[PDB]
């Protein structure tokens, strides 16, 4: 009855659902949770990145941003009665909700005009190989809803926060509430060194009252583990420059809620401290366990679904693709490992992902935009590498007031001919900026393409074409320099 | 024998570029002339060029500083409230921030002089005796004393441009860009002449800047905003300029300027139309400084306003050379570097070196800005049977939600539809200078279509889009706009 069933209306499944009916117009049905977003379970009909990721985050960063502005402007000459200023949190989250609802909206009416797509509320699970059930709860257990015969399932639920098991865990919360929080806390924890971690940790440090803190904790001892070592340096010190407390090499050990409703969090260390809010964002796991995916024999590896370069799974008839199969999580690469799978299935020709040199950033205050390798992977794998490193405060913010905010661009290649393998900034603008770079390392471009071209002056990005010289090498995994 | 090895006219960007590479690179004892040490009037340029002085430099802290009443107006569909009555803008403190900041780079250069040996800075205008002679005199005036007398074997002129100012009556009622850099204080009622990128930006800034009932008036004789950029950038900047309280008066020309008793200038146009502001500007273009030169006294030709130079920038004089504005190739200050980069390569290195004019990536800072590489269609289409334009524009969700609906965002890219080639790529919008830049290396690669949209995009931003546009929105085929039925 159906030909395609996907599991999940998200990044991912919204793409591959689209694009076969559309396309090669078979006729598929897909099954989320919810219609709308927010609470209970807060992921709905677009996904995470339209209900509680990428779309909402963006413009909590954005709101986040303006306190710079604000700051800043002063060095140019605009005034105004400093003392009236007010940051409100609930106009943001209020603005937040809408653009997201209407996102929710849009998507319903693509289902309800677009003829041979058919969207099931409710939780899905592999009954066999061929059918699906469309159930009213996680549990196994619960009432039939509908029942979906296939000829093909397409796995697509994402993933999911993952919360340590530790003493008081139910007095924290993860990134999914922080999206509907009432009021900004006064003093927050946001535990992890991850994108999500830092990435709150500036919207929160714009939004808090009076006499608020944000503390950030890591167990390792430098946030931003795969990114660029100075990039990780450097963004430590403009974000504890902007009232952040970063707390490395700690971890909580409990948590306890005081009598004020506030929480004494006790570090391994014998460290305590108390909070208003305790944020996990530690990681996020595929969600696999709803599925039943034994009722079918699909195979899982290290938690996701393990899938061939082709996102089949070992069941000819189901393939997974986006966060479940663990591979890149983020929104283009589910979207684009979901037109690559309908092509595979109901097209001619067999494409796959490329996962390499995917281009990606980080919303941090100043943000990151990165490329490519990290020299640590780079000189692992190529007998001499050579770093090209350029930092610099970029002149706006000398005049500014905000001297501290250096800018760092950063080129890594395989100096044997010259390819670029690597390029990582961390400033203002530097995820826009990353785009076009991705599609120079998309066609192998040489570190004198760069310097060949001629710059868009007065802008960041044409530092870029100013690295014509290394700062130093690895040769053999031994960093060496011209003398 | 004599002495030196070069002798640069003109300390800007290409003249202090060539000046450095001949010292360091090639140890040759070089000489370098600039008629002021440090920025401001008379001479408004000196040590460092236009770029430096009153050019980028100055003109984008002056923009960034326009930009904030943007995002201070903007801040408020996030949630941050302050009284906005208090809210006033000091462009006095703008001024004085942006002098120090120039005064900053002119002081460096002159330690940069201090601390190189076999480089020479000589302060005064300098011209021709002969081909292996220039002098340095005391001013512009062919008569004045001399001051230094230099003997060379080559001379590079890289004296620059100048604002053009028509002769209509009541010019010297008007000022040019350069002026409008110390201005005392903002122009309540403001007209900026020319359609071109220095009139756009400045608009914006005296909008941003301007008093209580302050208007900006920007006029060009024809019909619409920056000919030569892409159509519907046009059509979209003059929208978007419009909506944030600039008027626009296309095809009016100025046919003279008068002072009022009071001080303000009436303006009466050629079609009868008469206005009052408080200061004109005039932007309508921007001349080769070739007449101090003394050019004829070495025999160097002039074709349409600047020095006729080959690709490899030699004039038709041997031994003389010209890069930069003065050449009136692509008066941009990277351009005018590599230019001097490749010109002392060729001229004291081992192999010739020539600039590639193709493909150069630029911006207007306009508020929104623009971020331009490659052709516009019109010409494409006329290089090429097959032309396919993708045409892309979408309201930010962020503008969504800041209350400035009106900023869409216009991503297009043309390419030559037989082998798929990407020959321009033109974006309006906020970042579009920074998004550019990766796009002009793209370019020099000869990136098709399908590079771009098989690059995997950056979520969310606005740079993606131009990893998403797979299907063109139209066809120039021999210069007829056609579509796909
Ligand atoms: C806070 C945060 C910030 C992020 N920011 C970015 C960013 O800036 N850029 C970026 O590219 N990526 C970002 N991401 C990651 C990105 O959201 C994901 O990579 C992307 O959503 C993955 O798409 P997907 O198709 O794999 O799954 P999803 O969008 O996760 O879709 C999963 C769908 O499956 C549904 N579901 C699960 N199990 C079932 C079931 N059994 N039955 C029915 N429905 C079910 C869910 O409800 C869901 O809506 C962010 C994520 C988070 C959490
Ligand atoms: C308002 C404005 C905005 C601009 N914005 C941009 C921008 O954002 N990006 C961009 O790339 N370009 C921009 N430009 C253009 C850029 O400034 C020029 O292209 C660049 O300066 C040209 O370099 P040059 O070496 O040719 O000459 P210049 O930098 O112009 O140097 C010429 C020097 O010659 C001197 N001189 C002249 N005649 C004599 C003589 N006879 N004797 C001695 N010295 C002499 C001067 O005083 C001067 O300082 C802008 C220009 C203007 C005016």
Known sequence: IFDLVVIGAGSGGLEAAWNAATLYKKR?????????HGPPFFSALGGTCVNVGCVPKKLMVTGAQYMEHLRESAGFGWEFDRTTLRAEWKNLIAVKDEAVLNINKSYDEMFRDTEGLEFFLGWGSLESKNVVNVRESADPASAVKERLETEHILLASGSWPHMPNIPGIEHCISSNEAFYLPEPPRRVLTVGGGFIS???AGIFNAYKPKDGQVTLCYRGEMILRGFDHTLREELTK?????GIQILTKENPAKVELNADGSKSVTFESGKKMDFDLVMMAIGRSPRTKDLQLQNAGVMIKNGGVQVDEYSRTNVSNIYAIGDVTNRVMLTPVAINEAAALVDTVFGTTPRKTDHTRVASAVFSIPPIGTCGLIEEVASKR???????????????????????????????????????????????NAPEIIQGIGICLKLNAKISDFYNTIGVHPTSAEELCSMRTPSYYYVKGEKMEKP
């Open 28 to 36: 598929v049905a897909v099954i989320d949770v919810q219609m709308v």
């Open 198 to 200: 830092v990435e709150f």
């Open 238 to 242: 403009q974000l504890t420059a902007n």
């Open 382 to 428: 190529y007998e001499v590498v050579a770093v090209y490193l350029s930092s610099f405060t970029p002149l706006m913010h000398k005049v500014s007031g905000s001297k501290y905010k250096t800018f760092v661009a950063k080129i890594i290649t395989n100096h044997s001919d010259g390819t670029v393998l690597g390029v990582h900034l961390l400033g203002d």
